[PDB]
Design a protein around this ligand. Sequence first.
Ligand SMILES: CC(C)n1c2cc(Nc3ccnc(-c4cnn(S(=O)(=O)C5CC5)c4)n3)ncc2c2c(OCC(F)(F)F)cc(N3CCN(C)CC3)cc21
Length: 301
Amino acid sequence: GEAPNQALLRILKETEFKKIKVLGSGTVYKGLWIPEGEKVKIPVAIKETSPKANKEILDEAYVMASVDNPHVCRLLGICLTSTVQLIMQLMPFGSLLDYVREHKDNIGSQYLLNWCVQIAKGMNYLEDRRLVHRDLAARNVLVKTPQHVKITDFGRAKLLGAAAAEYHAEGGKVPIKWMALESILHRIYTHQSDVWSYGVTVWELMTFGSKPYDGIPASEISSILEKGERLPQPPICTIDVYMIMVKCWMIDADSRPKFRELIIEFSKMARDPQRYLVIQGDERMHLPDMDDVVDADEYLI
Ligand SMILES: CC(C)n1c2cc(Nc3ccnc(-c4cnn(S(=O)(=O)C5CC5)c4)n3)ncc2c2c(OCC(F)(F)F)cc(N3CCN(C)CC3)cc21
């Protein structure tokens, strides 16, 4: 079959961490984790009740605990109290979707193209691990620092079985406007359907947070795409960047780019960013007790 998953699932004591504030709901807290007698304090986000509810949060914990890459969020541990809590690395600047919205006027081309490279590295890693994310979107990329983003939200993620490289889903609330056409029609998901979502994600970034197909009810989307419509070329995008996006949206899934090629193409563009994104004012912009604080990326096993 396949290789044994020897990731370790760390069980954390409720006494080891302190909730500090609410960051979100739709419920994530900001907080501090102090492993018992280690002289470290680790900034964390804590994400908190039916029996199917905990069935799903544990599936996410399974996936999040099994990944280890600079451009994906890993589970630090879980806490098994009255309710199941995921303990994750604090990503201080929020989701990239909110970040590009709140900072339109000081995001230059170098940041945009580097984010594209980093997300492609994260997704290439997930493909190496035979993982299909199925929910890639700018809301699901977090900002550790403005120069370092990570992919998160594995609530739909699916490890491809030993043999077949395709997942068949059931119904539910699905993110239609980020999905390959073959997924909307036949509930088929592959790494190449993640490439489609990558293209939409890149389009969200190049429009500084626009909503894709804004106003169009999702029931219409499958027919729009069948007619050949796609998202429009964002004003800052040269044809070189827009052609990459459009290639992510081909009907033939095998004709879309591979993540490893998207790393290459956007790397090339990142060495001369003003040739590929045209932003008014680019070369002017700029983006940025705790004695024992250590980032999670420096706290290893
Ligand atoms: C919940 C997410 C998006 N979020 C954080 C997540 C993490 N960490 C992590 C690390 C790994 N995985 C997740 C995770 C799992 N699943 N998901 S998710 O929710 O499904 C999906 C995203 C929709 C997220 N979160 N770290 C800080 C923040 C954070 C934040 O930090 C600010 C500070 F605390 F650093 F100062 C501010 C804000 N906001 C700014 C204020 N406005 C009003 C609301 C949004 C959101 C923030």
